């Protein structure tokens, strides 16, 4: 009988294909056919509709995994018993869903994934963060074996001929008296990248939602790039230029995480050759990190 691992995830994308590669690896290893869900995705108005088609073309299949991705969540019930066991309480039970049960279900998905017998459960039902539980193959099997939109790809490979092409990118994202010290950090993350050696002529790409940031770090470096601005649209348009940037960023020759912990830059991390940021440990200390 055929047996199931639901995938859910509505928040960045770095979160969601991240939490997608742990879904994935424990269909993989117990024999299940693994669902993407991601209706309610907060890059999509309609609050039924799956965001994964939305974004990324069809998918059935991923290294073996038999894989529903589309709009079929809404039409198949699948079977239980469930796991986690929240799952299995009636839906009147279920409209409260506090932060408490979902870390919980966190933490019992980790446990079951590190179990040597599998659940006996005919759905699994991944519905928190499942970033760091899985194989760094895991992850790097789900970015290979999944394809961008047409409208999506189009975008990233008129942006590359235009600006990474010939050249050495050094990629630069930066989320968010307070805001002095971090563009003063920004710069001296910038000046450490470009003092390192590079093959092709040296350009600036730069990641951040400050019309500030960009101006001012423009202003104090040459050769500083950005892809430019252009209801339901605006969730659409929001997604793919979330994606455009995770993607580009992953091209780079070094990248600049301000801050590490974000999953926007996994994908970036997984790829390229050099990673600078700072040591949250030794906070105020810039590291540089060689990829194998
Ligand atoms: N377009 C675009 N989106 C970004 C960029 N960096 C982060 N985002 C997205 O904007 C939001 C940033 O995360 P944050 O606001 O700290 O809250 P989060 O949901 O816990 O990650 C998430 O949806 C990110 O995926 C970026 O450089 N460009
Ligand atoms: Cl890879």
Not at 36 to 52: H, K, L, M, T
Not at 197 to 207: D, E, H, R
């Amino acid at each position: 009988k055929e047996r199931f691992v639901i995938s859910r995830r509505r928040t960045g994308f770095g979160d969601c294909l991240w939490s997608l590669a742990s879904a994935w690896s424990y269909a993989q290893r117990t024999g299940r056919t693994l669902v993407i869900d991601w209706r309610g995705s907060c890059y999509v108005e309609q609050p039924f509709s799956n965001a994964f088609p939305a974004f990324f073309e069809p998918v059935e299949d991923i290294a073996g995994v038999p894989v529903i991705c589309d709009d079929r969540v809404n039409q198949l019930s699948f079977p239980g018993p469930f796991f986690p066991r929240w799952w299995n309480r009636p839906s009147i039970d279920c409209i409260n869903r506090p932060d408490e049960q979902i870390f919980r279900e966190r933490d019992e998905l980790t446990e079951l994934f590190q179990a040597r017998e599998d659940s006996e459960a005919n759905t699994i039902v991944c519905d928190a963060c499942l970033m760091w539980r899985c194989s760094e193959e895991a992850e790097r099997l789900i970015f290979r074996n999944i394809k961008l939109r047409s409208e999506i790809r189009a975008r990233i490979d008129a942006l590359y001929e235009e600006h990474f092409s010939g050249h050495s990118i050094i990629g630069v994202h930066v989320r968010h008296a307070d805001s002095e010290l971090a563009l003063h950090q920004v710069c001296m993350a910038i000046r450490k990248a470009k003092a390192l050696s590079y093959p092709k002529p040296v350009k600036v790409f730069l990641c951040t939602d400050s019309a500030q940031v960009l101006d001012q770090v423009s202003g104090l470096f040459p050769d500083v790039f950005a892809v430019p601005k252009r209801s339901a649209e605006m969730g659409i348009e929001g997604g793919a230029s979330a994606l455009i940037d995770m993607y580009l960023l992953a091209r780079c020759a070094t990248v600049i995480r301000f801050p590490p912990t974000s999953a926007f830059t996994r994908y970036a991390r997984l790829l390229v050759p050099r990673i600078i940021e700072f040591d949250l440990s030794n906070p105020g200390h810039l590291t540089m990190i060689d990829n194998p």
